[PDB]
Design an enzyme around this catalytic site. Structure first.
Site, PDB file in Angstrom:
ATOM      1  N   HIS A 210       0.792  -1.216   0.000  1.00 55.13           N
ATOM      2  CA  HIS A 210       0.000   0.000   0.000  1.00 55.13           C
ATOM      3  C   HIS A 210       0.834   1.281   0.000  1.00 55.13           C
ATOM      4  CE1 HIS A 210      -2.751   3.108   1.551  1.00 55.13           C
ATOM      5  NE2 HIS A 210      -3.737   2.404   1.024  1.00 55.13           N
TER       6      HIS A 210
ATOM      7  N   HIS B 299       4.057  -5.910  -4.328  1.00 56.83           N
ATOM      8  CA  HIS B 299       4.111  -4.526  -4.750  1.00 56.83           C
ATOM      9  C   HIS B 299       4.176  -4.470  -6.265  1.00 56.83           C
ATOM     10  CE1 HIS B 299       4.774  -2.055  -1.133  1.00 56.83           C
ATOM     11  NE2 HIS B 299       5.217  -3.177  -0.597  1.00 56.83           N
TER      12      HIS B 299
ATOM     13  N   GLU C 138       8.415  -7.133  -6.035  1.00 55.51           N
ATOM     14  CA  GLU C 138       7.903  -6.172  -6.993  1.00 55.51           C
ATOM     15  C   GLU C 138       7.553  -6.949  -8.246  1.00 55.51           C
ATOM     16  OE1 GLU C 138       8.517  -2.184  -5.099  1.00 55.51           O
ATOM     17  OE2 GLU C 138       7.399  -2.936  -6.828  1.00 55.51           O
TER      18      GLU C 138
ATOM     19  N   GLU D 134      -1.637   0.738  -7.702  1.00 55.30           N
ATOM     20  CA  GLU D 134      -0.861  -0.353  -7.103  1.00 55.30           C
ATOM     21  C   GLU D 134      -1.602  -1.081  -5.994  1.00 55.30           C
ATOM     22  OE1 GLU D 134       2.532   0.722  -4.799  1.00 55.30           O
ATOM     23  OE2 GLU D 134       3.478  -1.248  -4.975  1.00 55.30           O
TER      24      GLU D 134
END
Length: 190
Positions: free
Chosen positions: A12, A78, A153, A23
């Protein structure tokens, strides 16, 4: 791996795609698919948050949540927002380690996750880290973890190709499928 415990942290508060897909929404939905996949294996799960509202919990509360749960694994999801030519995943882990868990198990988790993401067809980042791994000292969330922990990621939201996967329900499931193989792979070693 049934009965083991995984903490899932849909990123977040540390961007968005060109179309404005955030995202926090991408990580949430992908996180839920990962959770469901893990549940199917008899794996126990917790989310860092219970909704996808505009706000989420701070870095300390999420660490306290993770540590209090003593999971077998912590995986944060993420997506990046850098130069648009950059595409693909990188797996972040704490280095130098601040405890023995970070020095070993978290690195094993990172390696296995990297291997499984590529094998599942998610490209390794071409713009950061090395061969889809990035050991770093600057992220509070990884540094504070006392149980095996990585921060994935999944791609760059500004990249046309990554964005296409992220914006698609089918693409999010593919990320989730890759993620579950990585999580399940690491749990099996433990």
């Amino acid at each position: 791996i049934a009965g083991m415990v995984v903490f899932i942290d849909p990123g977040h508060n540390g961007t968005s795609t060109n179309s404005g897909y955030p995202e926090h929404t991408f990580t949430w939905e992908t996180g839920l698919r990962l959770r469901a996949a893990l549940n199917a294996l008899g794996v126990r799960t917790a989310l860092s948050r219970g909704n996808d509202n505009a706000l989420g919990p701070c870095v300390d509360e999420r660490a306290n949540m993770a540590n209090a749960l003593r999971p077998n694994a912590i995986v944060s999801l993420h997506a990046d927002g850098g130069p648009a030519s950059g595409r693909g995943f990188h797996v972040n882990y704490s280095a130098p380690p601040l405890n023995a868990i970070q020095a070993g198990p978290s690195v094993q988790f990172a390696r296995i996750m990297r291997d499984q993401l590529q094998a599942s067809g998610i490209p390794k980042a071409n713009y950061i880290g090395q061969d889809g791994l990035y050991g770093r000292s600057d992220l509070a969330g990884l540094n504070l973890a006392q149980y095996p922990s990585i921060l994935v990621e999944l791609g760059n939201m500004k990249n046309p190709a990554d964005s296409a996967l992220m914006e698609s329900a089918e693409g999010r499931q593919k990320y989730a499928n890759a993620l579950v193989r990585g999580v399940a792979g690491f749990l099996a070693t433990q």
